[PDB]
């Protein structure tokens, strides 16, 4: 109405936006010009930068991460019973975009968390859908959802169990000799 307009703290990065004190904090979390953290699971990489610098950062500092071409692929997590915290990471290239496919194992019983993350903006993320499948002897568990923008992260997603979640007992129904195959399918909508 008539409050004092205090501008965004990312205005010095091109955020030509000025708003009141009551809605400043809530813009800056969902701002386009906010910096992106490293999408890799775990806190080991403390990197930060822009969306355009992410792919470079991944390619330069994370050469170990493999990229498969295809809207429909198989993500084979190997040695799934190695005790302690364990991460699996890969990327999927489809629809002119890169997606990050993560499987986390968190330790009394151990639980698996599997999620897909668009390397792009939030609004870009809403155009897509992903599907994760585990397949066994007359058994099939399937999670489907909208991929998260790396701008959001998976921390709160994983904390809210807002993804494919399953314990090690399930794992054993779908795995052969410490190998779990996750049929990942990305699609548009």
């Amino acid at each position: 109405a008539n409050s004092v307009l205090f501008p965004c703290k990312y205005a010095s990065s091109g955020c030509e936006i000025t708003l009141p004190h009551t809605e400043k904090a809530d813009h800056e979390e969902l701002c386009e010009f906010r910096p992106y953290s490293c999408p890799c699971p775990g806190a080991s990489c403390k990197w930060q930068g822009s969306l355009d610098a992410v792919m470079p950062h991944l390619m330069h500092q994370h050469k170990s991460i493999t990229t498969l071409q295809g809207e429909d692929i198989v993500f084979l997590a190997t040695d799934i019973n190695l005790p302690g915290a364990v991460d699996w990471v890969m990327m999927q290239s489809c629809f002119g975009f890169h997606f990050m496919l993560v499987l986390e194992k968190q330790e009394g019983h151990q639980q698996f968390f599997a999620i897909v993350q668009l390397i792009g903006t939030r609004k870009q993320a809403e155009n897509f859908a992903y599907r994760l499948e585990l397949n066994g002897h007359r058994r099939r568990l399937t999670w489907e959802a909208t991929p998260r923008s790396i701008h959001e992260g998976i921390a709160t997603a994983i904390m809210n169990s807002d993804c494919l979640v399953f314990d090690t007992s399930i794992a054993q129904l779908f795995a052969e000799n410490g190998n779990l195959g996750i049929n990942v399918t990305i699609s548009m909508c």
């Binding site: 775990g42 429909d72 190695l82 991460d87």
Partner: peptide, 11 residues
């Protein structure tokens, strides 16, 4: 079809 990536664990 479905190509297969053999991803290894990071601990």
């Amino acid at each position: 079809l479905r190509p297969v990536a053999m991803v290894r664990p990071t601990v």
